[PDB]
Amino acid sequence: ERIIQQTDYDALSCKLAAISVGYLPSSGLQRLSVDLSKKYTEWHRSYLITLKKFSRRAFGKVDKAMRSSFPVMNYGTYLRTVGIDAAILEFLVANEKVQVVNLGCGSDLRMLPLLQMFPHLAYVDIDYNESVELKNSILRESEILRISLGLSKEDTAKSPFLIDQGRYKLAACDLNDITETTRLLDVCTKREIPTIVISECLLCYMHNNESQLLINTIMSKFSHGLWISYDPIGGSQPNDRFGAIMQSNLKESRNLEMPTLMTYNSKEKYASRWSAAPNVIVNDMWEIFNAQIPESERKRLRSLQFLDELEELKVMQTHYILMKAQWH
Numbered sequence: 001e002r003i004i005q006q007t008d009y010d011a012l013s014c015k016l017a018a019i020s021v022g023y024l025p026s027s028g029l030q031r032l033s034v035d036l037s038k039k040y041t042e043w044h045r046s047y048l049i050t051l052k053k054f055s056r057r058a059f060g061k062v063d064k065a066m067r068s069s070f071p072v073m074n075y076g077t078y079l080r081t082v083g084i085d086a087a088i089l090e091f092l093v094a095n096e097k098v099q100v101v102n103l104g105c106g107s108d109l110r111m112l113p114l115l116q117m118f119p120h121l122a123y124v125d126i127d128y129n130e131s132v133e134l135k136n137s138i139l140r141e142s143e144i145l146r147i148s149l150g151l152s153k154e155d156t157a158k159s160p161f162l163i164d165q166g167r168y169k170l171a172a173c174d175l176n177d178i179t180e181t182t183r184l185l186d187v188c189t190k191r192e193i194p195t196i197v198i199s200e201c202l203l204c205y206m207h208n209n210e211s212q213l214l215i216n217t218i219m220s221k222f223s224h225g226l227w228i229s230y231d232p233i234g235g236s237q238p239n240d241r242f243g244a245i246m247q248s249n250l251k252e253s254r255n256l257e258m259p260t261l262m263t264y265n266s267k268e269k270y271a272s273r274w275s276a277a278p279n280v281i282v283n284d285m286w287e288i289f290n291a292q293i294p295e296s297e298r299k300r301l302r303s304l305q306f307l308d309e310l311e312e313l314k315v316m317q318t319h320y321i322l323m324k325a326q327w328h
């Protein structure tokens with residue numbers, strides 16, 4: 001589906017709007033160095049310029065949405081990035097040899113600083129065939145993105161991989177098909193190696209059958225893992241129409257569906273999908289803003305932009321969550 005692939009252009013507009021204002025990179029929570037903080041800004045800026053070369057339509061939707069970004073949505077992107085990063089970095093410090101499988105990766109460039117910071121970290125980007133062909137073109141075209149991953153300018157990878165360079169792999173795969181998913185994972189991951197499965201904004205666009213079989217198969221595949229899943233919820237409180245308005249606004253404007261939004265309308269119901277795992281934590285993004293983000297970080301974001309409506313940030317961010325299912 002071309003419309004589901006175009007949701008990544010909204011996710012890239014958020015990431016480039018946060019970096020352009022200053023929200024990211026947060027060098028403390030993401031644990032970036034002085035050089036890698038400069039590289040985080042320079043890799044994302046070079047991804048936007050290279051996206052212009054390969055697409056006028058995709059650059060037009062990313063550029064217009066980025067510059068029309070409000071302070072409230074920049075707070076939602078900050079908590080979204082440093083929340084998933086805090087869960088990744090805790091697992092990568094305790095476990096030296098780790099392999100990551102970013103399901104529904106899109107235009108995510110967190111693997112660039114992560115591979116640098118951890119010498120024994122493998123990584124595996126996975127998206128639709130059309131999406132990963134655009135990401136392969138952008139990484140191989142830009143000179144600075146070429147140096148980060150050790151890529152050539154030409155398409156030199158073979159068979160199931162568009163990129164196959166040492167400790168990073170890019171691959172095409174429909175995740176709604178479980179036969180295609182397990183065939184790819186057999187040739188790019190191992191059972192015994194500790195794992196971090198990232199499903200950032202992926203499982204919301206899938207039906208309940210395709211998403212539940214993806215959770216049960218991947219957890220049963222590895223002996224030791226950690227599933228950091230970010231997604232929206234419809235809201236549990238009565239007269240809370242956040243979920244019914246979101247399904248009606250996506251269907252009318254863009255012809256997009258979030259099938260299991262109302263089904264998993266709370267953070268408890270969302271976390272019950274990973275009930276097979278023994279240790280399951282779950283907190284909405286407003287709870288992560290008040291408990292996980294330090295006082296030094298909140299003062300820094302206040303210096304960037306005027307967040308006039310803090311209650312409007314609470315209403316939005318309570319309808320997003322960060323789940324962490326660990327098993328062994």
Ligand SMILES: Nc1ncnc2c1ncn2[C@@H]1O[C@H](CSCC[C@H](N)C(=O)O)[C@@H](O)[C@H]1O
Pocket residue numbers: 004005006007008009011012103104105106107108126127128131173174175176199200201202205206
């Ligand atoms: N069945 C499927 N197979 C492969 N990719 C899928 C998929 N369903 C949704 N996606 C991908 O999930 C992404 C959702 S937008 C999220 C982009 C990225 N994870 C980020 O957080 O910045 C899109 O890029 C889309 O292509």
